[PDB]
């Protein structure tokens, strides 16, 4: 298992070296979105939590297609604000409830070290 803790201050540096394969070894869910919310990476843990088959959600829009619950000021709103500002690092609890048993989670969104990419980390609470 890849030893990286949820909420780590330099997490973006650590994950910049990981391929989709290594991303599946994280102890928490990890999604990489582009500026428009399109899914570039989606690890196994995220699949476990949401029920989605990883390889099938890549290329889909997270806020429009995959996770409509999220599409709100408290989630998507924070995301679009961070994208426009070029800076993003926020942590909050949220309830995942679309076509799934309502699941409470802790979400951490942070701008990737890369150009136009952003991370969304999820773990159960």
Question: What residues line the site for ligand HC4 (CB under 6 A)?
Answer: 50-52, 66-69, 96, 98-100
Reduced to 3 states (helix: H, G, I; strand: E, B; else coil), residue 58 is coil
Cα–Cα distance measured from residue 77 to residue 60, given in angstroms and rounded to the nearest whole number:
19
To ligand HC4, the closest distance from the beta carbon of 51 in angstroms equals: 6
Residue number with CB closer to ligand HC4 (47 or 113): 47
5-8 long-range contacts (CB < 8 A, ≥24 apart) are: 6/106, 6/108, 6/121, 6/123, 7/91, 7/108, 7/121
Residue number with CB closer to ligand HC4 (13 or 64): 64
Residue number with CB closer to ligand HC4 (13 or 124): 124
Residue 42 in contact with residue 122, Cβ under 8 Å? no
Residue 121 in contact with residue 11, Cβ under 8 Å? yes
To ligand HC4, the closest distance from the beta carbon of 62 in angstroms equals: 7
To ligand HC4, the closest distance from the beta carbon of 32 in angstroms equals: 14
Q: What residue is closest to ligand HC4 based on CB?
A: 69
First-to-last CA distance in the chain?
21
Residue number with CB closer to ligand HC4 (59 or 68): 68
To ligand HC4, the closest distance from the beta carbon of 41 in angstroms equals: 14
């Amino acid at each position: 298992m890849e030893h990286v803790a949820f909420g780590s201050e330099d997490i973006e540096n650590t994950l910049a070296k990981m391929d989709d394969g290594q991303l599946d070894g994280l102890a928490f869910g990890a999604i990489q979105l582009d500026g428009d919310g399109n899914i570039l990476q989606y690890n196994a843990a995220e699949g476990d939590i949401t029920g989605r088959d990883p390889k099938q959600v890549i290329g889909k829009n997270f806020f429009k297609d995959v996770a409509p619950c999220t599409d709100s000021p408290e989630f998507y709103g924070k995301f679009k604000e961070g994208v426009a500002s070029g800076n993003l690092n926020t942590m909050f609890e949220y309830t995942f409830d679309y076509q799934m048993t309502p699941t409470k989670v802790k979400v951490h969104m942070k701008k990737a070290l890369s150009g136009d990419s952003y991370w969304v980390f999820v773990k159960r609470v």
